[model samples]
Target: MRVWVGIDDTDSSRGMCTTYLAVLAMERVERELGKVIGFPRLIRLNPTIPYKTRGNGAVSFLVEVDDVGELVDVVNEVIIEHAMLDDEKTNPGAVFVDEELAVKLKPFADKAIKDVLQIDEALFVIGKYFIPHLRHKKGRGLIGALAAVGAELEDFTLELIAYRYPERFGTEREYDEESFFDMDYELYPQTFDNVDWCNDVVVCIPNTPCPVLYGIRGESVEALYKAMESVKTEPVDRRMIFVTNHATDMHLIGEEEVHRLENYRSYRLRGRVTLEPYDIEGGHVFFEIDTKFGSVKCAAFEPTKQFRNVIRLLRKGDVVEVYGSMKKDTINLEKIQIVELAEIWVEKNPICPSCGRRMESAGRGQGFRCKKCRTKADEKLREKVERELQPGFYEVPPSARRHLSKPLIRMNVEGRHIFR
Candidate 1:
């Protein structure tokens, strides 16, 4: 019989990673059950959630076993032994599902990624379906565990992770810079997020105190393997490759009008700039979009870096299309396209007709006057200046980009990945 096993929230902020537990689980199952089927899923959930650890991820794998009850006992024992039970906030959970139950739980997985889910809802499903599950501490992780079991990787990408030794954890990761550039130069379009040249930073490696030394994301498993070969890094203890539905804009998959906007859901909306963008206390930019139905506030938060400048350049009447999630009644922008720039012209004081020198503003109601010649002029004397920005699409740089935010470079090649 085929079975699906899912686990989540086994790690804490100080150390340990759920993926690390997954690697160990895979080893144990293979030794006992002979062979595991398909690539183990490394699923990432809503990053915007308040109580989430760094990546908010879960892991699930498919396996074949003679006695399902015996396998569940073994897996549960492993989870209990390795999980960070001492941590106050780390609530861990594990779930087991048969082939028939896996099909029934897929919709729950889809909703978990795109919408806000409650613990009661997950518990209700568990009760109704009679799915075998276990939780420790707060047991909040049961929500993610069930979600991981239900996920259908209809669209996905692959990540190959190399883990460091226990002694190497919490220390600076070392890797050759030339190798990263060389890989990016040779294998771009096939492999991505290798190097953030603009920030003089390496994107593959994690700065956190987790088990993962570095990871390579790519379009094909072969490409990830090739990219991994080119990267020269410090000592690695173990590594594994996974097929995932991350960095694919899976959350922001639909379009909605302004009035129909729903909380916790991502959408694409096109409208005119009803309000000019302005900076908030924390460097977050805010503006309003006027669609056919109504108007809604939009934001380009500080973490987005230079993208805030693009938002600030927008003027009233500029038609634009924005893609992002709705949080706290605001559209947290992921990417924006300036579909049409209004006929905007900046006005300046006219040159003096007599002395050929620029004039100064007399006052609000008054016109312009040349200081040198004392030549006064009306509003007709104002000259039109050129605008700085042009019409085009703008997005956050690679370093500040979220997992689900589609990079500008992946425009034409979206969803074109090779599984084998």
Candidate 2:
């Protein structure tokens, strides 16, 4: 049977452990039942659900079981043996334990799960916010608790967890957990200042960022690459599955990934052309699409490679368009996949949520503030807009800039509003 496991933290994004517990439990169910009951297949609901915003404080699993009684037994076992069940304090969606030995053995147990399979530790990277809290008073016992729920402990180095999800945790973190624990890298590992975009421009995405795939039938691989280069002048093709972050825009005006100024790469693309793939395996093939134009590669998972199970099933003449980041591979470029996946279908473009009118900015130097509806963007949405919208200039009083909690204001239909 298949299952959908949605993991999340508390409202503050502090409940990753809750999310981890649910995942491990489901895995345990599949492992144990495979010998007798033979139920397998688990689905990660991270991308399946907007757990961060919509599923706060809850990590749920939707599974298909033969007997209702079996489901009940599985849920009970998972809830009981989950990692937080042995934790020293009661965290959201978890239970707590109060044993010194439980504290001592945590790392060893964490290592067991981490080393045995590259999975749990990688999963740990996606849930670092919960690891420290689970480390108990007696370090060794922490391992025992982790092992009880299928984790491994190891040399005090938590480097394994840091590798898979380097974006969330940092080097200093793996080096000295106690030391950099207090520092927050508001943008990312490193930051650069003094650039125009960094100091003044706000980069925004009209909506949740998505990726665009090239190298397939009806796919204008060149048009997509052109859109990336013309971002400073033309309307960013929202149709293209690409987005930006303001923090990255600011510091990464020209810097590349080596500078750590941006989390994703800005593909300053040139001329483009055709791409094709080859099948090296049945039901699982090696794919290589030729995007004649040069491409920019970013460091992320090869979504295409990971999703090969489905890709290989395509018919010989079936041209599939896959979207992902590019990484330098042996003097050339290789594409790594992103979170979203879809066949070559028209992507959802942005429209005003208020008046339902297609949005348009008055000029290259301005933004789309709906004059008809007099609707404006909220701070979060505005930041998204600034990062995604074209870059330009604006003027504000120094005092207004200094004291305003939020930088943008909502003007009414009559153009009346107060600075927030």
Candidate 3:
């Protein structure tokens, strides 16, 4: 009999990763369940969730096991042994589902990706269906576990993850920069997040203290295999490649125009800017737009780095289409399409025609006078300075990109691979 085992929220901020926990579980599955059925799934959910760990991901394995009892025991033992229990926020959850149950759970998975989930709702399903499950600590992870069981990756990308030894978790990860550039040049548009040449940074390696040494995302597993070979890095304890719904912008699908946006879910809306974009205290850009539903606040946060500069260019009366998750009352921007940019020009004091020096403004609504030539001119002498930016779609750079933000390179290409 084939069964799906889903696990989530097994990691803490200081250490551990859900993918590593999944690897340990897969090891036990091979020992007790005989053999795994297919590629283990590393599913990334809503990245914008505030209560989530680094990736907000869940892991599941499809296995064909005769001794179902033994398989469950092994999985439970692995979760208890390897999961970070000391962290107050690290609540782990696990669930087992049969083929019929998996089919019924797809919609749950859809909502999990597209919106926020409640633990009560997940518990209700678990009780109604009588699926064997376990939740540790707050059990907030149950939402993701049940969601994983239901998720079907019709379109996806593969991420090849290499792990480090437990003792080396916080240590710095090193890789040959030249090798990454060479690999990226040869396999670019097929293999992404390898390197950010513009920023002189390596995009594949993580700065966290988690088990992942680096993860290479690509269009195909074969491309990932070849790309992984190019990285010269520290000692790797183990490596696993997962076929995932990441980098596909699956969460941003549906409802291009939203009447009312549900908080913590992804949405796309087209509207005119009611409030001009301005910088907040933390360098985040904030603005408000008038959508069909109502006025919606939007933000382009600092971690997006240079992307905030693009948002700063927005002005009132500009029409834009924004793609992002709704955080409270704000739409945390991911990508923006400038449908129509309001004309913005700088007004400079008129130049002194006699001395070729820039004139100074006399006063508000008054006129201009040349500091050098002392020549007075009317307000008509003020020149309009053209803006540098243009109307089009703008996205965060590769260095600052999120896992679910589809890159421009993937445009026009269909799914990387379809998994049954």
The TM-score between candidate 2 and the true structure equals 0.21
Q: What tens digits encode model 1's per-residue C-alpha lDDT throughout 159-262? A: 88889988878888887988987998788868876667666777787889878988787789888888878888897788888887767877774554334777
lDDT of 2 by residue, 1-420 (tens): 432222222122222234344445556655654322221111111111122232112323334444434544554466555434343433222212222223433453333322222334423532552332222232322222233322111211100000113233211111222112112112211211101131222212111111111101101234333323322322221221211111111111121223232222222222111223344433224433323333322221232233333333332223222322222331111211111222343323236778787555645655555677766542222212111211111212212121101111211123211211
lDDT of 3 by residue, 303-342 (tens): 7777777788777888888888876778887777788767
RMSD of 1: 4.7
Tell me each candidate's TM-score.
Answer: 0.86, 0.21, 0.85
Ranking by TM-score: 1, 3, 2
The runs of at least 3 residues in candidate 3 whose Cα sits more than 4 Å from the true structure, single-residue gaps closed, are: 253-258, 343-386, 413-420
Candidate of highest lDDT: 3
lDDT (C-alpha, whole model) for all candidates: 0.79, 0.27, 0.81
Q: Number of clashes in every candidate structure?
A: 0, 51, 0
Name the best candidate (by TM-score): 1
